[PDB]
Every structure is written in structure tokens, then in C-alpha cells.
Amino acid sequence: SKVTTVVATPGQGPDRPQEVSYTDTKVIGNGSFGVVYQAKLCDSGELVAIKKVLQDKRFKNRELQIMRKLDHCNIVRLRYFFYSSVYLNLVLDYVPETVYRVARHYSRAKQTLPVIYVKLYMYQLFRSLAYIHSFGICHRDIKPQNLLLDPDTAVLKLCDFGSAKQLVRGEPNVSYICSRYYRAPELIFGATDYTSSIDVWSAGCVLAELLLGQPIFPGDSGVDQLVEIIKVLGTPTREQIREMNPNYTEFKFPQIKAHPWTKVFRPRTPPEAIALCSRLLEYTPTARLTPLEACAHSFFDELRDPNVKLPNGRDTPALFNFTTQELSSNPPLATILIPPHAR
Amino acid sequence: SKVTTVVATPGQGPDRPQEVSYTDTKVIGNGSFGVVYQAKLCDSGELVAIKKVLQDKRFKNRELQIMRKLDHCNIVRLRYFFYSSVYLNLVLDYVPETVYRVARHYSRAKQTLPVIYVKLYMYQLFRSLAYIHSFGICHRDIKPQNLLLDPDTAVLKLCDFGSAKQLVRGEPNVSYICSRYYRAPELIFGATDYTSSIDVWSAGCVLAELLLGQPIFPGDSGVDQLVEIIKVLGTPTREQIREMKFPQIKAHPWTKVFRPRTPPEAIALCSRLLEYTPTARLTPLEACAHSFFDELRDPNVKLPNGRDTPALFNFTTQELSSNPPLATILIPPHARIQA
Ligand SMILES: O=C1Nc2ccccc2/C1=C1/Nc2ccccc2/C1=N\O
Ligand SMILES: O=C1Nc2ccccc2/C1=C1/Nc2ccccc2/C1=N\O
């Protein structure tokens, strides 16, 4: 078949390009950004994904700059990058499924994702967030379609850093990032001074969705979304509104009082799952758990049990190889995060 | 069959309570706002819609206050309102179809609505907007699901004033109103000083959608939406952004957007509605006067089913107030013939 050879620059290390050959190209994803292809490396026979985007030569691609610095087991790895035509081509790890597709399979089969997988996937997402956040980097587009999954190993990898940005105190950021159902209230209210905790709200929406079988805060307009949020969290206090967006414009919302979180999910739902959701989906941004505190939550204790296994009989992926960087926001959590048996 | 009798206040006359009895109730629409039912009046056997929403005792319902003052052939009429349980119930005209349902029928059959209907529906939507805007009222949620249609008469009625508000110069307004695909760029950018022209952008999105067979500016995030907009309008100039980090793609020949044989006037109207600079967009009245609607002003025009078109020229002074001289185009010669 058609073999393409290019001279590409390695994602990490010194800037020393090498000839790379690949074949068996085919589309696997789209979006406004550009196209994602699957390809096979002639050398190793390995499958990789190539994300191709139009690049204005007069400026540095921000996604590329962020990817060159990331190195984590729960984030898709940038293997190489090269230019063609002008297009920037990001050669990344290929993962065969997404949380989006898997949840949809269960959904239209009238089944819910077994909790052991909800635990595994969410724990790995929080690890990836603790890592990028320790560098001040906010993903800003956490949603099921951006959570890659390997069906057999149960490994999850965060992808698509096209909206990612280092958030700096006092510097304004656009409020129009983040996909519909996963946007934190402060973004809906138009704040430009938000923090990385908007990713935590997004992660809480994904957890709730996996437990429920459908999005927890749907709506075609910001108003409709806020109504679904109010039905569950109750009406925001004047103080809470202040904390979300210092410059709120003022709207009249029907004063509704908190709907018992336990009344939200089906009866069999683990109580720890519900408590974690309530600590993630909070109006006050600073009141939400940090990613690391989420990883340490009791909902994930089963993952720390010495004898846990995947339903397919294999062992769980690596869950405890935390680095100092990863733990930097709160070192003492290591006593919970790294169980007695792990190494 | 269960019959409900309530004592209700008339939509607009003097406050003379009336006894209203209805039956055969069923949900025809839902939403975060409140449920809309269809019901049958016992006496005349006529169908009506009942929109029921929770009513706080802190404020009087804004949709209710706005609808008590509206009277127009292209806006659904508030007949009565009454409270129950506390719920506010608005009794309104019933229309059997929506642009949303009609467009979906054609779309999933790989066809587009015949252009004569695009003309009729869009013209009537622009008339309804010229009317509410002449009172400074902005709908703020123009979308296919809020455009009611009568299949046989081709009459269109604007509905759902749950987001509507009188916009006053210098007063801030929330930027989180309006549905996803139909939001003006300035709302996506978070402006709180927008004008009624956000309804015009929304109307342009509906026209483009009816011509195309699918939404013209889809996207799950504001960023994705802006990229689809830029692909068509080109990159906003610094000045345009002011009036309201993306790749500098240029101006896309709107002609490349629609299928071959799409009327050139349809394309020109779309380009004058979907403009970055809000003040640069046509006003509703100017849109009605656009050449894309000339066929509706032809003395011999008929609906495909053979019936005559609905009333299109009975403009009032209020309706024309934003630009009286347009009447020389809006009211065709044959519509001025003496009785
Ligand atoms: O394996 C992958 N590596 C990536 C790196 C960056 C962006 C996407 C991907 C990607 C993807 N893998 C998929 C498997 C099934 C359906 C969609 C995708 C996808 N993308 O839609
Ligand atoms: O006939 C109507 N009068 C209304 C007044 C206010 C709000 C809605 C309506 C309304 C509606 N008519 C419909 C016909 C088919 C599907 C949905 C609707 C609907 N609404 O979804």
C-alpha cells in the first residue's frame, strides 16, 4: 500500500528529527480543529494517531507547545510532529475507544457501566488533571469524547489539548470554551477570572453521567442548563453567585431548594459515588475537591485493594506510580494514594 | 371524559372574569421553563395550548406581562390566564406544527423545503420581530422550535416569550440566553450590552438552515461555533470584534455554501443578516422589504395547495414606526386598491 515517509521531530528530548515511515491511513475523528487519522508505523508495526491542523506559520501552535512538555501514563503521548502541505501533524498514541462510545453502548443496551469501570476511568482522569494542574495548565474541554480508553487494559488517556491554557492569576480568559453540558456555572455566567477548578466541575459531570446513563445537566441554552443545575443544587445564594462571577449581571431565578442528591441516582448507586459527586459539583469553585483529593476519595478505595482485578481477569493498570510533581499540591495525600502493598 | 372549569382573566380586554371549561389534555411540549399542553374547549370544541409554569410570589411573571400587551397576527395570542395548584397557566392559540418538525421531516427524507415556503415563513417571522422590536422588546430565543406553523394556511406564529425582555440602553443583560446554534457572535463573546439585533442573527440562522437542510453554525462549544462562523464570514477584523486567537481564514463565497440553483436573492439576504457588526445587520422591516420576498408581493401569487397567501400587507403605524418610508415597498400597489 501507499507508504509515506517524512522527517519528523521527536515529541520529547532534544530537537533532533528522524526519518519516519507510515502506512494504512484512515480517518477516525473530525471536529472544527481538523482531522485525526490512524496510521501504522512501518518500523514497529505500531498503530498511531495523526492529528492534522492548518498552521499559520507566523505563530507557535499552543497545543504542540503544551504537548511537548507532558509526560504522564494517563495522557496521550506526543510521539512526533512534522509539517506538510501548511499543516502541523501531531503523531500521537492511538487508543481504540472513548468513554463517549462505551457509555453509549451501555446506554442503548439499557445497561449501566459496571461501577468498577466508573471507578477506574474516573480515578485515571483525576490523576491526569492533578498532573496538568500542577503545571498551572487547565484543559478547558473535559468531556466523554476526549477520554480515550483501552477496552482490554482499562487504561484511560486524556486527549485533545486544543483548548488547553496555562491560567495565570489576574489574567483574563475567554468564557466560551468547554462543551455544552460540561461547563461550570461560572463559565455559563460569563466569568473571565475562572481557575482550573472548571475541569473539576466537568469531571463531576462525566461521573454523574456514567452513573445516570445520560447527561446530568442538559439544555440548549445557558438558561436551560442553569435550571437543571438549580433543580439539583438548589438556588445559588447571593454569595455563591459572587464567587462564580464577580461581575454578574443579575437574572431572576425561581428559588428552589436543594434536591436530595441521593434522590438523583438509581437506588442501587453506591453512596460513596453520590458523596463524591456532591463534592465535585459545588457552586463555589474553591469549595470543590482538587483532582488529588478526588483520587484519595473513598469512592476509589476498591482500586487500592491488593486483590482487585479487572472483570476480564487481567490486573488493573498502574495506579500508584505517583511522582513528586504529581503530588506537589498536597504531599501528605501520598499516605492514602500509595497503598501499603504497592510499589 | 374529565372536564375542567376555571375562572380566568381575559388576555387583554377589561378585567371581566370568564368561566372556561376544557378537556382532552395532553403534553405537546416540555422544557426547563414549564410544560405546554394542548386542550379542547368544551363549548366550541376548539383546540388551545396551555403553558403552565411555577409562579413565584416575589415577582409578577415577565412572560405574562409582555404577552398581555401584544396583539399581532404572527404572534400566538394570550386568550386567558389563571392560577392553580402555585402555577400560572397561560391559555394560548394552538398551532399544529413547528418549523423544527417540518424541517426535520424534509431533512431526514433528503429534501429541502420548497422555496416558496421559506419565503412565506421567514417573511412572517420578520414581521413578528418588527412588531415586538418597535416596543423595544427582544425575544432572545429565536429558533425553529419556537416558530409555529399551520400546514394548510401557511401562517407562522412566533411563540414562547419566556426569555423576552425590554432592552434599555445602558442597562446590562445576561449573555447566557438563546439556544446554541442560533446565538449571535456577540453573545458567544459574552457581551451584556447587546441589542435586539441578536434576534435578527437568529432569524438569519433559521433561514440558512431551511435553505441548507441542516444548522449552518453547529458546534458543542462556543469555540467550535465561532470556527464554523469564521469559515463562512471570514476572520473578524479587530474593529468588528470591538463592536461585538482564531486561525485567520478568509471570506467564504456564500455561493459555495448552498446547493446549486439556490436563489441568489436568498444568499444575499443571508449575508445581510449574518454580519459580525450588529448595527450592520438589516432591521426586521428592512428584511421584509428585501428582494428575496418580491414574489410574495406579486398580485397573482398562490400557495401550492391553490389557496391564497395569508394576509401579508396589513401593516400598522406601530409596525412601520422604525422606518415609515418602507411602506412604499412593503404595501404593493394592488394592496392599495380602493374598496
Ligand atoms: O487514538 C487516538 N489518539 C488521539 C490523539 C488526539 C486526538 C484524538 C485521538 C484518538 C482517537 N481514538 C479514537 C477511537 C475511537 C473513536 C474516536 C477516536 C479518537 N479521536 O476521535
Ligand atoms: O400550538 C402551540 N401554542 C403554543 C403557545 C406557547 C408555546 C408553545 C405552543 C404550541 C405548540 N404547538 C405545537 C405543535 C406541534 C409540536 C409542538 C408544539 C408546541 N409547542 O411545543
Hey, what domains does chain B have and what are their CATH numbers?
4-96 (3.30.200.20), 97-339 (1.10.510.10)
The reply to whether ligand 1 has any atom less than 6 angstroms from the CB of A94 is yes
Residue A294: CB partners within 8 Å, gap ≥ 6? A122, A126, A200, A203, A276, A279, A280
Catalytic residue among A141, A193, A301, A305: A141
Contact between residue B236 and residue B280 where contact means Cβ atoms under 8 Å apart: no
What span, in angstroms and rounded, lies between the C-alpha atoms of B70 and B66? 7
Distances (CA, A) of B259 to B192, B244, B326: 36, 30, 32
Residue A59: CB partners within 8 Å, gap ≥ 6? none
A32 assigned ligand-binding residue: yes
Q: Does A65 touch chain B (CB under 8 A)?
A: no
Q: Does B313 touch chain A (CB under 8 A)?
A: no
Distances (CA, A) of A35 to A11, A38, A106, B223: 19, 10, 27, 16
Among positive and negative, which fits the CA dihedral A190, A193, A194, A196? positive
Q: Could you tell me the distance, in angstroms and rounded to a whole number, from the CA of residue A64 to the centre of ligand 1?
A: 16
Resolution as reported, in Å: 2.1
CB contact under 8 A, A223 and B59: no
Q: How was it solved?
A: X-ray
Active site residue A193: no
Q: Is A134 helix (H, G, I), strand (E, B) or coil?
A: coil
Q: Does B178 touch chain A (CB under 8 A)?
A: yes
**Cell numbers placing A140:** 478547558
Would you report the helix, strand and coil content of chain B in percent, each value rounded to 5?
A: 35, 20, 45
Question: What is the helix (H) or strand (E) element at residue B56, kind and residue range?
Answer: none
CB contact under 8 A, B54 and A254: yes
| DSSP states along B86-117 | -EEEEEEE--SEEHHHHHHHHHTTT----HHH
CB contact under 8 A, B172 and A249: yes
Closest by CA to A280, choosing from A102, A131, A145, A126, is A126
What span, in angstroms and rounded, lies between the C-alpha atoms of A189 and B176? 7
Residue B175: CB partners within 8 Å, gap ≥ 6? A190, A222, A249, B187, B190, B191, B192, B194
Sheet holding A155-158, edge to edge: A97-98, A147-150, A155-158
Question: Counting ligands in written order, which one lies closest to the CA of residue B162?
Answer: 2
Contact between residue A126 and residue A291 where contact means Cβ atoms under 8 Å apart: yes
**Cell numbers placing B172:** 446590562
A173 interaction partners in chain B (CB closer than 8 Å): none
Q: Is B141 helix (H, G, I), strand (E, B) or coil?
A: coil
Closest by CA to B133, choosing from B294, B292, B288, is B288
Residue B135 DSSP class: T
What span, in angstroms and rounded, lies between the C-alpha atoms of A213 and A200? 20
B75 conformational bin, left if phi > 0, alpha if psi -120 to 50, beta if neither: beta
Q: Does B188 touch chain A (CB under 8 A)?
A: yes
Question: What stretches of chain A show up as alpha helix (H) in DSSP?
Answer: 62-67, 99-107, 115-133, 185-188, 197-212, 222-233, 238-244, 271-280, 291-295, 324-327, 334-337
Question: What is the helix (H) or strand (E) element at residue B172, kind and residue range?
Answer: none
Contact between residue A243 and residue A189 where contact means Cβ atoms under 8 Å apart: no
Q: Is A109 helix (H, G, I), strand (E, B) or coil?
A: coil
The residue with cell 519528523 is A8
A232 assigned ligand-binding residue: no
A254 interaction partners in chain B (CB closer than 8 Å): 54, 56
